């Protein structure tokens, strides 16, 4: 029945729904668990489309912070790794189905994995979207390999120093996302409309040439591991990330 989405399938197409509101749309460890079951029935059954969505003010901002805090105040010694949320991540862009993000309201690291995982990212003129990790000596590792194959790495790179978010219209201008109207359902609509006409065999097989074409995203993912376990078991990054979830930011 899921903790953390609700689940909803329609003819060829499943929505999943983040039903998080207590840690704003945050990341925990549940929500990737109950991902990556929903998508193993996506992989075989009949359907073709896979929307992730619930987001009135938040599709998702990141990972949780005063999780990464209170883990600490309980006996956290050495991060968690993030494999599972990066092959789900992975999933999204090699599964035999089309993956849409439906995006609206404010996004950082994390949300934007998913967005830039999915096949295809719409969204409302509400959305905006950041990366404000830098701040605390931190930076999105496992977002940015999939950030960086729709924006290109100098996007990514300016994206990343400048902390600031980015319009809705930056985002279409740059590839983050494709398409995007004040009426993102009926927007959407008139995506799942032309996706159903195509078939989950030419789908698979398409997804799985594209795939085969270009391994940046998996070539990638041990460096970005590695590197996420390590920002996070450094100290003064941890201290930075600790005496700001209390006070002062620096």
Known sequence: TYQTIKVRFQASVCYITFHRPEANNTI??????????????????????VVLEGLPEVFCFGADFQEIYQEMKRGRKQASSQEPLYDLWMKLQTGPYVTISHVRGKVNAGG???????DI????????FSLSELLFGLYPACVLPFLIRRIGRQKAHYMT???????????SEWGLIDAFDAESDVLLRKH????????????????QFMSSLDHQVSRAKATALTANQDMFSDPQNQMGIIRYVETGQF
């Open 28 to 49: 925990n460890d549940t929500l990737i668990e109950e991902c990556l079951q929903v998508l193993n029935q996506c992989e075989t059954s009949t359907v073709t489309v």
């Open 112 to 118: 934007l994995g998913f967005v830039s995982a999915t």
């Open 121 to 128: 990212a719409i969204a409302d003129q509400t959305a905006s």
């Open 161 to 171: 120093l400048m902390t600031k978010p980015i319009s809705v219209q930056e985002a």
């Open 192 to 207: 799942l409309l032309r996706l159903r006409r195509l078939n989950k065999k030419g789908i698979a097989h398409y997804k």
